[PDB]
Design a protein that fits this description.
The structure is cut from a larger assembly and holds chains A and B. By secondary structure, chain A is mostly helical. Chain A is built from seven helices and no strands. The longest helix of chain B is centred in the middle third of the chain and has 27 residues. Chain B contains one helix and no strands. The chains are: A mainly alpha, B mainly alpha. Chain A: Belongs to the proteasome subunit S2 family. Chain A: This is 26S proteasome non-ATPase regulatory subunit 2. Chain B: Interacts with GCK; the interaction occurs preferentially at low glucose levels. Interacts with the proteasome.
C-alpha cells in the first residue's frame, strides 16, 4: 500500500476493500499525522467502501494515543449517522477503537443516538453497541 | 451531494493538520 499504493486497496473485489483500507491505519498505528496524510490520500474515493475503510483507518491510527486534538472525533463524526450503513459501519467502529479507554461523554452522546433509527441495520446497531 | 461532504472533510483535515503541526512544533520548542 505505502509506495505503489492504490493497488492492494483495489482488486479486493468490493466488500474486502473496506478492510484493506483499514490495513493502512494499522500500518500507521500511533502515528496520527502520518496517518492523516496517507489516509486522507485515500479518504476521498468514488466508492463507499474505501471511505469507510479510511475512516476505520483513522480510528486505528488514533487508537491507544490520546491526542489533545480529536482528529478521529471530527472525521468520524461527520460520517456517523450517514445515509449509508457502510460509512456508518466504519466510522462507528473507528470511534469505538479510537476512544476505547476514554469514557468520554461527548463521543457517547454522538454514538448512542444511532442504535435507534429506521436507517440502521443490525450491523450498524451491533457495531454501535 | 457527497462533494460538499468531501469539501468539509478536506477543511477538517487541513485544520487538524495545522493544529498537529503547531502542537509538535511547540513540543519540540522545549525538547
Amino acid at each position: 500500500l505505502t509506495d505503489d499504493g492504490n493497488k492492494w486497496l483495489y482488486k479486493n473485489k468490493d466488500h474486502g476493500m473496506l478492510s484493506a483500507a483499514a490495513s493502512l491505519g494499522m500500518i500507521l498505528l500511533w502515528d496520527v499525522d502520518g496517518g492523516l496524510t496517507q489516509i486522507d490520500k485515500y479518504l476521498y474515493s468514488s466508492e463507499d467502501y474505501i471511505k469507510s475503510g479510511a475512516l476505520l483507518a483513522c480510528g486505528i491510527v488514533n487508537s491507544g494515543v490520546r491526542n489533545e486534538c480529536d482528529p478521529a472525533l471530527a472525521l468520524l463524526s461527520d460520517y456517523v449517522l450517514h445515509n449509508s450503513n457502510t460509512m456508518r459501519l466504519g466510522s462507528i467502529f473507528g470511534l469505538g477503537l479510537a476512544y476505547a479507554g476514554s469514557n468520554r461523554e461527548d463521543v457517547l452522546t454522538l454514538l448512542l443516538p444511532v442504535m435507534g433509527d429506521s436507517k440502521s441495520s443490525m450491523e450498524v446497531a451491533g457495531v454501535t453497541a | 451531494l457527497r462533494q460538499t461532504e468531501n469539501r468539509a472533510t478536506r477543511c477538517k483535515v487541513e485544520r487538524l493538520q495545522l493544529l498537529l503541526q503547531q502542537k509538535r512544533l511547540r513540543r519540540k520548542a522545549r525538547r
